[PDB]
A paper describes a structure:
The ordered assembly of [name] protein into amyloid filaments defines a number of neurodegenerative diseases, also known as tauopathies; they are the most common proteinopathies of the human nervous system. Here, we used cryo-EM to determine the structures of heparin-induced filaments assembled from recombinant full-length 4R [name] (2N4R, 441 amino acid isoform) and the corresponding 3R isoform ([name], 410 amino acid isoform) to resolutions sufficient for de novo atomic modelling. Our results show that heparin-induced 2N4R filaments consist of a mixture of at least four different conformations, whereas heparin-induced [name] filaments mainly adopt a single conformation.
At an overall resolution of 3.7 Å, and with clear separation of β-strands along the helical axis, cryo-EM reconstruction of the [name] [name] filaments allowed unambiguous de novo atomic modelling. The structure is strikingly different from those of the 2N4R [name] filaments. Whereas all three 4R filaments contain a single molecule of [name] per rung in the β-sheet, the 3R filament core contains two [name] molecules on each rung. There exists no exact symmetry between the two molecules, which are arranged in a parallel cross-β packing. In one molecule, residues 274–330 are ordered; in the other, residues 272–330 are ordered, i.e. the structured core comprises only the last residues of R1, and most of the residues of R3 (this being a 3R [name] isoform, residues 275–305 of R2 are not present). In heparin-induced 3R [name] filaments, 306VQIVYK311 packs with itself, reminiscent of the homotypic interactions seen in microcrystals. Whereas the AD and PiD structures did not explain the role of disulphide bond formation in [name] aggregation, C322 residues in different molecules of the 3R dimer are within disulphide bonding distance of each other.
Author numbering:
A (entry chain E), B (entry chain D), C (entry chain F): 274, 306 to 330
D (entry chain B), E (entry chain A), F (entry chain C): 272 to 274, 306 to 330
The structure:
Amino acid sequence: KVQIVYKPVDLSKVTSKCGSLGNIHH
Amino acid sequence: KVQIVYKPVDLSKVTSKCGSLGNIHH
Amino acid sequence: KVQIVYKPVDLSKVTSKCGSLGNIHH
Amino acid sequence: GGKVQIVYKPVDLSKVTSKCGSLGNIHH
Amino acid sequence: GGKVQIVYKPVDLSKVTSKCGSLGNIHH
Amino acid sequence: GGKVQIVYKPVDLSKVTSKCGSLGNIHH
């Protein structure tokens, strides 16, 4: 009996966060 | 009996964080 | 009986953090 | 008995790019 | 008895890039 | 008895790059 259970789990996340705040006056 | 359980778990995360704040006046 | 349990766990994280604050006046 | 022949040679040339540019308040 | 032949030679040329540029308040 | 032949020679030329540049308040 031949059993080839080929189940790859790919949970790799490629994230890119950016925030620009210009001239805060209070 | 041949059992080849090929299950790679890939949880590698490539992150890039940046924040720019210009001229804070209070 | 042949059992080849090929299960690599990849949790390697490549991070890059940066923050720029210009001219703070109070 | 079971004889298994596997020639597993993957060629992965995949490129994942995450480009981001933040621009706030520009004067001229 | 089970005889197994595996020739596992992966060629991984994959390139993951995370470029980020933060720019705030520019005067001219 | 089970005879196993494995020729596991991985060629990993993968390049992971995390470039970041922070720029705040520029005058001219």
